[PDB]
A paper describes a structure:
The brightest variant, the double mutant HaloTag9 (HaloTag7-Q165H-P174R, ΔI = 19.9 ± 0.5%), as well as the dimmer variants HaloTag10 (HaloTag7-Q165W, ΔI = −52.9 ± 1.2%) and HaloTag11 (HaloTag7-M175W, ΔI = −44.8 ± 0.8%) were chosen for characterization with a panel of 46 different fluorophores and analysis of their photophysical properties. The decreases were more pronounced for HaloTag10 than for HaloTag11 but in both cases caused by changes in quantum yield. The decreased quantum yields and fluorescence lifetimes of HaloTag10 and HaloTag11 presumably result from PET quenching through the newly introduced tryptophans. HaloTag10 and HaloTag11 decreased the brightness of all fluorophores relative to HaloTag7, HaloTag10 having the biggest effect. Photostability measurements showed that the higher the fluorescence lifetime, the more photobleaching occurred, making HaloTag9 the least and HaloTag10 and HaloTag11 the most photostable tags.
Self-labeling protein tags such as HaloTag are powerful tools that can label fusion proteins with synthetic fluorophores for use in fluorescence microscopy. Here we introduce HaloTag variants with either increased or decreased brightness and fluorescence lifetime compared with HaloTag7 when labeled with rhodamines. To engineer the binding site, ten amino acids on helices 6–8 in close proximity to TMR were chosen for randomization by site-saturation mutagenesis. The changes in spectroscopic properties result from single or double point mutations in the direct vicinity of the bound fluorophore.
Numbering used by the authors: 3 to 295
Write the structure that this text describes.
């Protein structure tokens, strides 16, 4: 069934003094499609989606700094750090116009970049994306107590850094179907050493929940306001019950956002790519054929 391999030849580019790894496949010409993963994944999360798009479009899938095969500088790994590295990655590859395919923290990066570079975005496909979570009641009940505990320097660092709970617990709890041992080993590989787990803990502490942190909430509100008035073509994938995006929120956005098509992938939590990669990939390819790219 769902592929477990990661066949892609490694590419690296140096930005801000550090190497970022990326997948780069597909034809060399045309408008490239840039795939941005989130927490606690890597370009591995796109492995079964890219092959539907790569016949006809260049596919670029970087690993965020400190994640995947990318370098591990001694950083706080705040969202702001990821913004600087991704801004530099995009420019270092000489990308001009792009289509974005974005998920989780990759979607905050993608939307924030699109807001600041709107002339260069030809379309955005997005799923299980960062939006303001106004209260803890709007976080899924099944995941509420653990995410509240993650957002502390005592229990949260014990769980995420020392016990590897984000990889061993939260990740499988973000996929409806069972992950195999081989898939788990691909997700574990960047984080075998606890000293390398800072991004896994800082990311949930950056999530915009109940107004906190104020700076992230403001930045996310700004890109959501931009998205609501942007003519950019939009493709929204969602599942039931979801995690960041409940079905009601997907339906609300499908109506409120200009030029937006929405696609139900079936059962899904956070890593929709792991529950229905073939629908996501095939639908991205079909939608791309309708764009002026
Ligand atoms: Cl997170």
């Amino acid at each position: 069934g769902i592929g477990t391999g990661f066949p892609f030849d490694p590419h690296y580019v140096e930005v801000l003094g550090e190497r970022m790894h990326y997948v780069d496949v597909g034809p060399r010409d045309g408008t490239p499609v840039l795939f941005l993963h989130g927490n606690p994944t890597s370009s591995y999360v796109w492995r079964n989606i890219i092959p539907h798009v790569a016949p006809t479009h260049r596919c670029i899938a970087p690993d965020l700094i400190g994640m995947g095969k990318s370098d591990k500088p001694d950083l706080g790994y705040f969202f702001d750090d990821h913004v600087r590295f991704m801004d530099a990655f995009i420019e270092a590859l000489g990308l001009e116009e792009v289509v974005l395919v974005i998920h989780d923290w990759g979607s905050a990066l993608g939307f924030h970049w699109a807001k600041r570079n709107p002339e260069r975005v030809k379309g955005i496909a997005f799923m299980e994306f960062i939006r303001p979570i106004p209260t803890w009641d709007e976080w899924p009940e099944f995941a509420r107590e653990t995410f509240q505990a993650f957002r502390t320097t005592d229990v949260g660092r014990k769980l995420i850094i020392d016990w590897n709970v984000f990889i061993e617990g939260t990740l499988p709890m973000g996929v409806v179907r069972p992950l195999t041992e081989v898939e788990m080993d691909h997700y574990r590989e960047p984080f075998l050493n606890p000293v390398d787990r800072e991004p896994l803990w800082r990311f949930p502490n950056e999530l915009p929940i109940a107004g906190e942190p104020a700076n992230i909430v403001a930045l996310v509100e700004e890109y959501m306001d931009w998205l609501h008035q942007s003519p950019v073509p939009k493709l929204l994938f969602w599942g039931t019950p979801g995690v960041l995006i409940p079905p009601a929120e997907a339906a609300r956005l499908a109506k409120s956002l200009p030029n937006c098509k929405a696609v139900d992938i079936g059962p899904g939590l956070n890593l929709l790519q792991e529950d229905n990669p073939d629908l996501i990939g095939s639908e991205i390819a079909r939608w791309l054929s309708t764009l002026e790219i």
